[PDB]
């Protein structure tokens, strides 16, 4: 059912070494990401995200996005600041994009409140203001959401600028991975 208290889950957003991030731009990504989840199935009853904005010594070896994320997730496993928090959610953030204007990446279906471990729930996101909702889309993937046929959904495969989950399938998956059950209502 509804838990006795919302679970504290940290979303730890690490500025890539060498990147320059701007405050309003990163704030927009983090608030859009938080709101995209809280808007679903009354999820503030189940989770209160602490978005943490910090830094990392890691930088992607190139513009190769898959290489970049594989290296970022590995870097977390021996990052002394992240010790004891292998069950949280992590984003590497930069100003620009990756090769061919890739906007972000994520490990799909990598966070569940019961099994989270080993820094598996991790991804990367641009923060440029012209790409609202990228972190929210990647967080959706981390929570198990798949691409949708509806082009007005946050989880359309193509960037559209939209910010909200519309797919009932995705909303059920995301909420289930955060402890929700259908009998709980919204």
């Amino acid at each position: 059912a509804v838990p006795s208290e919302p679970k504290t889950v940290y979303v730890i957003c690490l500025r890539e070494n060498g990147s320059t991030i701007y405050p309003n731009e990163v704030s927009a990504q983090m608030q859009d990401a938080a709101n995209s989840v809280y808007a679903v199935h009354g999820l503030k009853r189940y989770v209160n995200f602490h978005f943490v904005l910090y830094t990392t010594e890691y930088s992607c070896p190139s513009g190769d996005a898959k290489e970049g994320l594989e290296g970022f997730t590995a870097s977390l496993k021996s990052n002394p600041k992240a010790e004891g928090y292998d069950d949280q959610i992590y984003f590497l953030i930069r100003w620009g994009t990756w090769d061919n204007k890739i906007l972000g990446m994520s490990w799909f279906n990598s966070y569940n409140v019961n099994t989270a471990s080993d820094f598996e729930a991790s991804g990367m996101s641009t923060t440029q203001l012209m790409y609202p909702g990228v972190m929210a889309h990647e967080l959706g993937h981390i929570l198990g959401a798949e691409h949708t046929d509806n082009s007005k959904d946050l989880m359309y495969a193509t960037f559209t600028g939209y910010l909200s989950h519309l797919s009932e399938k995705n909303m059920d998956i995301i909420a289930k991975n955060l402890g929700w059950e259908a009998a709980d209502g919204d």
Partner: nanobody
Framework: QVQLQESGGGLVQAGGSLRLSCVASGIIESINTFGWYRQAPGKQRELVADISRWGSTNYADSVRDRFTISRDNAKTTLYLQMNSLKPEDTAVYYC??????????????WGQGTQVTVSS
């Protein structure tokens, strides 16, 4: 997921004007950048003018203040007003749309090209 069709080319004399039009059909909100490219014989294709989904425009230095790009309210039609034309503007002009996948990046869609010939 989008289809582009452009028109308006022709032969004009130096100093003349032409107005190009491009109509997009399909998933219009997938268009991140809507624009015009051109290719002249022996030369590489080059950006002429484009407009972002947020309304920001870019022009090639050589056409700034002679050409104007615009997009209609419905977002399906792109215009290129070409004034004060020069022989250096002779080219096949292509309508273009960039889509961006969150994880996959940019994909290019093209029109068929419309020939522009500027005689002197």
């Amino acid at each position: 997921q989008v289809q582009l069709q452009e028109s308006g080319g022709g032969l004009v004399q130096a100093g003349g004007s032409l107005r190009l039009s491009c109509v997009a059909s399909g998933i219009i909100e997938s268009i991140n950048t809507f624009g015009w490219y051109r290719q002249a014989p022996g030369k590489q294709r080059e950006l002429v003018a484009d407009i972002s989904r947020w309304g920001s425009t870019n022009y090639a230095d050589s056409v700034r203040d002679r050409f104007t790009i615009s997009r209609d309210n419905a977002k399906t039609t792109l215009y290129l007003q070409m004034n004060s034309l020069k022989p250096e503007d002779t080219a096949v002009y292509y309508c273009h749309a960039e889509t961006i996948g969150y994880e996959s990046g940019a994909h290019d869609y093209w029109g068929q090209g419309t020939q522009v010939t500027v005689s002197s």
